[PDB]
């Protein structure tokens, strides 16, 4: 038996009012750590705050949608625990008004669109995004981050970000969101469905 240890700690988010923010927290340990999200020390307990567990039990994502300001702006804590010990770490959510959104805050110029791929063929989800600094584009599938490092690869060029899913299969079906992030903040695309025919 071993105490909880973090494998992925949440990273500060600046979102826009009405938009989305996600925080990721994973840990290992034996027995399997329970992950609880707190807001300034109390368990999160509001309808717009949703905890989605990774299928493998490694942890969870706290997803907040729609973001409200000033209400949601706070320090949040991820607490990992089992019968041998407990650890926590915190992260910060900032939520900007339209009135407060910087010039270079990421824009989704073109979000992903509905796709149907034949099984074993490459599916490509597309996202055009811009901002200053040039934002990083990442992908969420069914509210969880798509990690890619390789059947599933992410390609990137000027404002275009692509998620290429080689040898597509049934489990790749789902709801994909493009996420654009830079030092000014994080913007989500509307989700697009992928089907595997």
Curated annotation (Swiss-Prot):
Superkingdom, taxonomy of origin: Eukaryota
Location in the cell: Membrane
Residue span, Ig-like C2-type domain: 4-94, 106-195
SS bond partners: 25-78, 127-178
Modification(s) after translation: A cleavage occurs, separating the extracellular domain from the transmembrane segment. This process called 'ectodomain shedding' is thought to be involved in receptor desensitization, signal transduction and/or membrane localization.
Quaternary structure annotation from Swiss-Prot or TrEMBL: Interacts with PPFIA1, PPFIA2 and PPFIA3. Interacts (via extracellular domain) with SLITRK4 (via LRR 1 and 2 repeats). Interacts with SLITRK2; induces presynaptic differentiation. Interacts (via the second immunoglobilin domain) with IL1RAPL1 (via the first immunoglobilin domain); induces pre- and postsynaptic differentiation of neurons and synapse formation. Interacts (via the third immunoglobilin domain) with IL1RAP (via the first immunoglobilin domain); induces pre- and postsynaptic differentiation of neurons.
Record's function text: Can bidirectionally induce pre- and post-synaptic differentiation of neurons by mediating interaction with IL1RAP and IL1RAPL1 trans-synaptically. Involved in pre-synaptic differentiation through interaction with SLITRK2.
Family membership: Belongs to the protein-tyrosine phosphatase family. Receptor class 2A subfamily.
Protein name, UniProt field: Receptor-type tyrosine-protein phosphatase delta
Species of provenance: Homo sapiens (Human)
Encoding gene per record: PTPRD
Range of the intact protein held here: 21 to 226 of 1912
């Amino acid at each position: 038996e071993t105490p909880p240890r973090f494998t992925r700690t949440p990273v500060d988010q600046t979102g826009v009012s009405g938009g989305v923010a996600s925080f990721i927290c994973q840990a290992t340990g034996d027995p399997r750590p329970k992950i609880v999200w707190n807001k300034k020390g109390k368990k999160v307990s509001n309808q717009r705050f949703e905890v989605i567990e990774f299928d493998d039990g490694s942890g969870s994502v706290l997803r907040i949608q729609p973001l409200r300001t000033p209400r949601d702006e706070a320090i949040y804590e991820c607490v990992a625990s089992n019968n041998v010990g407990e650890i926590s770490v915190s992260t910060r959510l900032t939520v900007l008004r339209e009135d407060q959104i910087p010039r270079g805050f990421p824009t989704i110029d073109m979000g992903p669109q509905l796709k149907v791929v034949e099984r074993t063929r490459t599916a490509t989800m597309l996202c055009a995004a811009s901002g200053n600094p040039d934002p990083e584009i990442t992908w969420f599938k069914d509210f969880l981050p798509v990690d890619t490092s390789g059947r599933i690869k992410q390609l990137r060029s000027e404002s275009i970000g692509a998620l290429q899913i080689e040898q597509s299969e049934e489990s790749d079906q789902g709801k994909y969101e493009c996420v654009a992030t830079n030092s000014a903040g994080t913007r989500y695309s509307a989700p697009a469905n992928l089907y595997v025919r």
